[PDB]
Subunit: 725 residues, 4 copies
């Protein structure tokens, strides 16, 4: 059924977004390999040139019809071909994850910069030339597997390391703290954020009564709520967010020394988030935006890269801060404990089948390896129970490690047997130890510097059996305040806006008031600006609440801001080029040449599909229409010259610019395209953030690419209130 | 931990029963191979020289202890090694089969004698050089997976053929008919025979009210009930029973011609059954006796062999018989339609792990291949729905064909995706057809002579949509009567005893009377004989019920008897040798040499464990004692000469002989061994079936092996009441 | 279909073993009540005088045939009555218990002799007039749900107390100790006594290599092994064996004082076991002998009693 | 059988008939109804064959399929009239 020209089928080379249909990773990049991807070969199933069969291997002659008694007669029970096909269909679905159901994943590899054997015996960190395959799943938290990507939410960032000494799963989030202190409260918190149980509304949103009810009653939540209400809660891409393990864990070296450690991922593409209006509209225009962007970046060669980093605290410093190291609502400011760079992780191939590899993957923070260990963090402690347990229903049984994506690439042998869907056929005469009948194989292995058995660090435990929160955990305001004061003025404004927007959707007014009261214990300016938007007036008492203390003398920590310290990297970003029916090919040449030199992609847009022909006869295929791929999905907009009259009174073309303008994106206007300055009210002598010139050229591209390096035009904020867009 | 002399490890070569501990098939017989066993290699897991790990590949240091706070303190929730191991244990079991839950399985291979391409295009039957791997599971029907082997029950005989054109499952039983006509009634009959629902008694027995209630009210059951009540219901081993597909199926040749077919398996070892007292006793002494016999035969190189046979009826002969070919309560007498030999099956390797290969195996009579097709048999029709449906809970979901033992060895490719425990990772860009994006692969294949798609035979259907039994099925007594008349008089007596014992356990006297009434419609002598064991007296009306008509002129068919035509073979049978402390080592040499020569095994027994020395100094190792390994488990008993004084007086030795005598087993006595005649009341002149002489040979061993070939000494029956055992 | 005389139906009065067909407890003894049995009334389904229906409440006209095109024709996919009946049958079974799969259970009640409030605040022990419904399941350990009752084995004795302040399950055995010290070894011991993995033999028996391999290498097992090898391993009936919680637990009183406790059940019918040859022969003549004995004792009014 | 975990999905409260339902079906995962019927099969005499089939009738009768004539060969074939 394919067309003549082979163009049903994508080129198996890197291609920019939109240049080719997307494809399964092994067909797209068949030369991209690693030990884990190779090991999946036993279960990869091709298709070309094969006969269509039942699952039992019987060739089907007619896959268009049920078996019936006469061609208008009833379907017959003996049609086993229909019933196998429909049975398999009828049982496709499995329970989605209780939380982080929505997520997107890829393969890649990790390697350390130098050996860490002085601080850890973990084998995967032992040698700068020893590469460890990874599989990474990014996710939201609240919504179902079919909810939208660019919600306001925390994001999950889970890395499965297939090491020589075991699977290590580093199961983190994109903020450095969690909402709650003790795992016992997790069902209460998750139920409060999830859709409400009477009507199962709202999907993918904290903006509802039950969430803000819980928050207002549990001030320990305020720190992660601050991060969620900031632009952290709406990342531009999974490539442009930070990742954190949250908990303090331990590194254990060959000599037995424990060092406390917190884990960080630093996005090498820099930190970048959307703005709210854009993020919310994008949930409607492309609810798959982050899934798509990640797949397309990998297909293009813009591999997501992250630097693993460790905050390291000696054991004797456990009590030296003014917060508890074991409290997952508290961060360790980098001004106090810097992040030591550890290694680099590159994501360089997409999966073959989303369901088989992404939906069935199982990550669990208990999956550690010798050289790592846990602490008493009471959130971390209960997570260790839940991830093994939940897999029993989600993946159908205790043999979930035999599902191909989850399998260790290193040896695994033990005495466990049976369970639903058991794949492994054990030959061992023994299924117990100690045994003589197989000479006690497989055997225990004593702990040691490498290739040793797992032994827990022998932490001293002293206390009575109590259900009690540590007094050291009972402080809730000083870290929210540190985060607040570390944000730029525009970031602070967006935080105020995020709180105001969420609370406006709370139906019960006393709940809004209680949350504003909580804000008054963090920062008066923040409390008042939220109050004003809610038509609430602070009491005298509220205006007099003493600010919480600084965090160990810190008045701000700029590492907590997305933007205070520039780190922008334009490679893999995308520009909309608004075409006309007589495009000046000299502008297009200059634009594409400069974009290509910085790995910035382009999309050619028009008022219909098909082709337009430039002034020099160059035939331009049209990627999408103005309405069909809105400015939400690109980082900047260029309008080349040519026949501007063609698009000058097109409502969609004008709206495209008004939207990109509103959302603080760089805009460049060449030649007569400068006439569009009218729709967005730019001063004749110009505006910082709008690039203009008689033609698109060297200098014009430079100015545009500098603005893109800075991500958005924050100085335009005062001007966007007036535009009706 | 293994002993210094290596005596823990079974010899990896053929050894007779009891010589070596039993072992997993690929460790016992590593040189045995077939295409299926080869393709299972990728999931087989070893053990020697490997480290003990978690399922995530983490080496375990201490597999003897939980992690606790202090060595007498509480267990910690962070012990992930304990929770993984306990979790897998906690979820070991899967539902058992609804029916046939009790069964034993082995690998083997099939080969046809000649090409049958003139009558079928089935590829596995197309070439005398085409060898087809098989996996065969034999079973009882009623009991659980943990019930006894030698119960009275029908047996299952299910063969999975891994053909080049698909899995073909031949899912049969050891009797040629079933209890019921229409699949709709299956839950009724099976509930009736199964343990009663209030108290869940009895296990593995039809001897209870509800079974006989149903039978008494559903005369269509009486034919298979006659089989079950005969010695057919207590086979000596799975090697010495017949198998039958029961239903009429079709062979379809390359030209499109349909031929009606009924399937047969002929045991090359001959047909042989236990007697009731033996079979019931063995359920107590060795409830695994048939599973053990199958395993040990294969370990010895005594492979079970069966001949596939076909009864073939041309389409135009569909109505040529007194009974409906579609009626699964009717058999086709071999005297009207002979069985044509088709091929040989040899079962030559045990599995490696019972649960993974046997318990998870899924057979379904709907799994046919091009060259075979169904008919409208209304029991068969219903089955085609059930065996697909049941696997969704039993085996966890729609991907049960990916469980290794179930996998085809030929190619399988299609558009089905997902489902719980999905192993195959599909790389096809398309998961639908028709598609252009993968040029419509995998593709449909037209039907053809070889390697073609499945098309159903275009049988003509005409009639209204009815829930109605065909009147042609409404005859219940002629087949039961043919079966009865074809039995020898000792077989007839055993049938009488079978009904008599079962009905004796029915509490409600009226159910017994109604079953006696049904018997009077079959045969008066059989009815009177059961009535008299039950203290029931036939009425005048019952005494005058006209017998049912013969079956197409036949008043008997000897192929229906176990024994009427000698087919007895001795290879793989076992003789008890009752030792004394001074054995005539010349007797032993001749005995074992004649036994060896015929492939008969020997088991040396004495009054205690350890050893004895013969007349010439030879050390005789003792396998077990008289009391420890009773006669129940052997086929004959030899008592050699020597110091008979040593055990003439022994209660165990005497009992051994009285049990063996009561169970109709051949006995041979040499020299003073003839003293034993007293215990079993033999007269001096000798008795047919008791072998005697001065020395244990000349023709003392030809005589005894001749008795063994005839299986049991039927003539002894009139004398066994006299002996209290 | 019932006989004219009515002899199909067992009398709703206590009768000795074998005098009447056995029957569902609420039809055999409809006036034996306790609070639990009363609370199950919402889910008990009768049958007499009701029409045969699908599970969706649709009356069935012909429960003897599938729907087919002609009376000798193929079965039609549209027969929802057949498919529902066969679907339910096809999915009847659930996984059996990993251990103690073979067991027999009965309803009853517990009452204390005196208030134990000086040593425990447990509400079901606070007053001798406090009656606590129980459900008790007795079991073997090794064999499947289909295995024989009078095997040599440890027996389970599990009591569910439906108290006014929560379910208390007292999950014990018939000997006062267990085979092993630390729960991490439970899968090793259980795998060793269970049928061996290659061939799944032997059912309901410790008499095999792997069991004795483990015992010989783990001397902590020897105490319970001694009990299993004694006639304790072959009880005459569940009414004539002891029960034990094995572990030391704590009682906590209202003042917060903790007392260590080990739990016992003393059979008021006394202790009695079979002898080996009799037990082993019974596994063949009546593999349901203890299940039968329990059910029939209760039917006769010979109620199992334990202190 | 997968989505709602077994063949007793009709006992999940929202799914329950409000009219009588009785039959010989037993067990299954999540089984809520405790059947007191001495019989779990029909035909039976031990419960006088209850619950009983009901002939079709103008009201409260058993289900019987309309006796449509069926005539043709067993075919996997789209009707030309659908083309
Ligand atoms: C005690 C319960 C509990 C608590 C306190 C947490 N979680 Fe969790 N989390 C789960 C119980 C859980 C889970 C129910 O077990 C999930 C869902 C299904 C699954 O496979 O794991 C899960 C999934 C889940 C995933 C998705 C992994 C994937 O992509 O499959 C991430 C990234 C996180 N969690 C991260 C966190 C972080 C950073 C936490 C706080 C610091 C946290 N979880 C607290
Ligand atoms: C409509 C239901 C139905 C009917 C009428 C039959 N069966 Fe069946 N049979 C099943 C429904 C079933 C089942 C529920 O589908 C089983 C149990 C679980 C499984 O895997 O299949 C099964 C198991 C089963 C097994 C065990 C296969 C194995 O070893 O795993 C054999 C040998 C048979 N059957 C043979 C027969 C024969 C010879 C029948 C009469 C011709 C028959 N069955 C009628
Ligand atoms: C950590 C594993 C483990 C350990 C050390 C034990 N058991 Fe257990 N036991 C189980 C894991 C288990 C189980 C897997 O959880 C079962 C099987 C299915 C179930 O519902 O509970 C069980 C069932 C079970 C039953 C059957 C309950 C019933 O009738 O349904 C009894 C009577 C016991 N056990 C008694 C004991 C005693 C007295 C023990 C030692 C003092 C013991 N168990 C140790």
């Amino acid at each position: 059924l394919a067309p003549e020209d082979g163009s049903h089928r994508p080129a198996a080379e890197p291609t920019p977004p939109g240049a080719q249909p997307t494809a399964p990773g092994s067909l797209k990049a068949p030369d991209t390999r690693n030990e884990k991807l190779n090991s999946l070969e036993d279960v990869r199933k091709g298709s070309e040139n094969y006969a269509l069969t039942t699952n039992q291997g019987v060739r089907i002659a007619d896959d268009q019809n049920s078996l019936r008694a006469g061609s208008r007669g009833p379907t017959l029970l003996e049609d086993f071909i229909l019933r196998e096909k429909i049975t398999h269909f009828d049982h496709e679905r499995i329970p989605e994850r209780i939380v982080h159901a929505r997520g997107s994943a890829a393969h890649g590899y990790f390697q350390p910069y130098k050996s860490l054997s002085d601080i850890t015996k973990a084998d995967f960190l032992s040698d700068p030339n020893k590469i460890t395959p990874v599989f990474v799943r990014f996710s939201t938290v609240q919504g179902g597997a079919g909810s939208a990507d660019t919600v306001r939410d925390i994001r999950g960032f889970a890395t499965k390391f297939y090491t020589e000494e075991g699977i290590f799963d580093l199961v983190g989030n994109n903020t450095p703290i969690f909402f709650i202190q003790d795992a016992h409260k997790f069902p209460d918190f998750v139920h409060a954020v999830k859709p409400e149980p009477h009507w199962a509304i709202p999907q993918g949103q904290s903006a509802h009564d039950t969430f803000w009810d819980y928050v207002s009653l549990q001030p320990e939540t305020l720190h992660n709520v601050m991060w969620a209400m900031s632009d952290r809660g709406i990342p531009r891409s999974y490539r442009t967010m930070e990742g954190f393990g949250i908990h303090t864990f331990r590194l254990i070296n060959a000599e037995g020394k424990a060092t406390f450690v917190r884990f960080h991922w630093k996005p090498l593409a820099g930190k970048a988030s959307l703005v709210w209006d854009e993020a919310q509209k994008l949930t409607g225009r492309d609810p798959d935006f982050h899934r798509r962007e990640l797949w397309e970046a990998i297909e293009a060669g813009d591999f997501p890269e992250y630097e693993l980093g460790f905050q390291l605290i000696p054991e004797e410093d456990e009590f030296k801060f003014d917060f508890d190291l074991l409290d997952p609502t508290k961060l360790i400011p980098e001004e106090l404990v810097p992040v030591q760079r550890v290694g680099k992780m590159v994501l360089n191939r997409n999966p073959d089948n989303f369901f088989a590899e992404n939906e069935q993957a199982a990550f669990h923070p208990g999956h550690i390896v010798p050289g790592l260990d846990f602490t008493n963090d009471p959130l971390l402690q209960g997570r260790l129970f839940s991830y093994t347990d939940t897999q029993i229903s989600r993946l159908g049984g205790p043999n979930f490690h035999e599902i191909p994506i989850n399998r260790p690439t290193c040896p695994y042998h033990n005495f466990q047997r049976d369970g639903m869907h058991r794949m492994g056929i054990d030959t061992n005469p023994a299924n117990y130890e100690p045994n003589s009948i197989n000479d006690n194989w497989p055997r225990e292995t004593p702990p040691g510097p490498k290739r040793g058995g797992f032994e827990s660090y022998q932490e001293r435990v002293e206390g009575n059996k109590v259900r009690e929160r540590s007094p050291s955990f009972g402080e809730y305001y000083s870290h929210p305040r540190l985060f607040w004061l570390s944000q730029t003025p525009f970031e602070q404004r967006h935080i105020v806006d995020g709180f105001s927007f969420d609370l406006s959707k709370v139906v019960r007014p006393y709940i809004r008031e209680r949350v504003v009261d909580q804000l008054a214990h963090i920062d008066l300016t923040l409390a008042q600006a939220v109050a004003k938007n809610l038509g609430i007036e602070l009491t005298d008492d509220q205006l007099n609440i003493t600010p919480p203390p600084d965090v160990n003398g810190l008045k701000k920590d700029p590492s907590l801001s997305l933007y205070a310290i520039p780190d922008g990297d334009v490679k893999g970003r995308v520009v909309a080029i608004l075409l006309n029916d007589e495009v000046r090919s000299a502008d297009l040449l200059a634009i594409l040449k400069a974009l290509k030199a910085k790995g910035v992609h382009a999309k050619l847009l028009y008022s219909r599909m098909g082709e337009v022909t430039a002034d020099d006869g160059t035939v331009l295929p049209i990627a999408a229409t103005f309405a069909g791929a809105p400015s939400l999905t690109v980082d900047a907009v260029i309008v080349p010259c040519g026949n501007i009259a063609d698009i000058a009174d097109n409502g969609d073309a004008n709206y495209y610019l008004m939207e990109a303008y509103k959302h603080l994106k760089p805009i460049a206007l060449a030649g007569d395209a400068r006439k569009f300055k009218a729709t967005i009210k730019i001063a004749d002598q110009g505006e910082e953030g709008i690039v203009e010139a008689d033609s698109a050229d060297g200098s014009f591209m430079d100015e545009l690419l500098t603005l893109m390096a800075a991500h958005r035009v924050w100085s335009r904020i005062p001007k966007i209130d007036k535009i009706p867009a």
